[PDB]
Amino acid sequence: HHHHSSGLVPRGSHMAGTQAHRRFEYKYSFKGPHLVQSDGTVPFWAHAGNAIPSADQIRIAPSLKSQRGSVWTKTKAAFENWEVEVTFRVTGRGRIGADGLAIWYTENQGLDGPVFGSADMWNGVGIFFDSFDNDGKKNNPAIVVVGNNGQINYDHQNDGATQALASCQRDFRNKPYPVRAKITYYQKTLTVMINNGFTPDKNDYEFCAKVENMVIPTQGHFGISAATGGLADDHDVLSFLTFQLTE
Ligand SMILES: [Ca+2]
Ligand SMILES: [Ca+2]
């Protein structure tokens, strides 16, 4: 509650459609155009690995083999209820690609590791956009919600199927328009909605998965990461927009 004050008039203008229940969290957000500052950094966010930010997007992991990249908020958020809207592209030659992209709310920053570019044994929630079918069950690309409390090693080989709280099968690769994921944590419920990028309409969201009465840490960083394997897609994020929800 209470409108954001630590912002310039150009940035106010820049984020106009976002400011105009829902309170825009400027300090936990990024977008183009001019996504990046004259010194190459994304204001309020740190990047690591192979991630390279530019004016229009952050290429988290480019289409080389065995790449890892991530981007994380510099500080933790402390929101009872929240909603992130993440806009991205996963592009590659051919109908099959690897490995995928992850959106995180975790207690620490997962700068580097083996889990879509970020740290294993995390404390909080990952939403995994897993493009490659490691278990051969012919059910990728898939979106899987994986909670963790610092104890679990992510089961890469089964596509996290044995550890997933919820999941849906959606092809988010090679789409005419950017793909969008909206992730909502509200009154103990985690919801994933996907805009699959067939349409110019940015609000054409379809239900994907839900976890009722989920627990997550009271404070955490938001993050996004990706990785490639033998096959390699470009994984690009165009914007990450955070909102704090009340009542
Ligand atoms: Ca996989
Ligand atoms: Ca699979």
Curated annotation (Swiss-Prot):
It comes from the Eukaryota. Residues 22-245 form the L-type lectin-like domain. Ca(2+) 1 binds at residues 130, 132, 134, 159. A carbohydrate binds at residues 66, 99, 134, 156, 229-231. It is found in: Endoplasmic reticulum-Golgi intermediate compartment membrane; Golgi apparatus membrane; Endoplasmic reticulum membrane. Ca(2+) 2 binds at residues 133, 135, 139-140, 159. Disulfide bonds join 168-208. Exists both as a covalent disulfide-linked homohexamer, and a complex of three disulfide-linked dimers non-covalently kept together. Interacts with MCFD2. May interact with TMEM115. Interacts with RAB3GAP1 and RAB3GAP2. Interacts with UBXN6. Interacts with SERPINA1/alpha1-antitrypsin. Interacts with BET1. Mannose-specific lectin. May recognize sugar residues of glycoproteins, glycolipids, or glycosylphosphatidyl inositol anchors and may be involved in the sorting or recycling of proteins, lipids, or both. The LMAN1-MCFD2 complex forms a specific cargo receptor for the ER-to-Golgi transport of selected proteins. This is Protein ERGIC-53. It comes from Rattus norvegicus (Rat). The gene is Lman1. The chain holds residues 43 to 277 of 517 of the full protein.
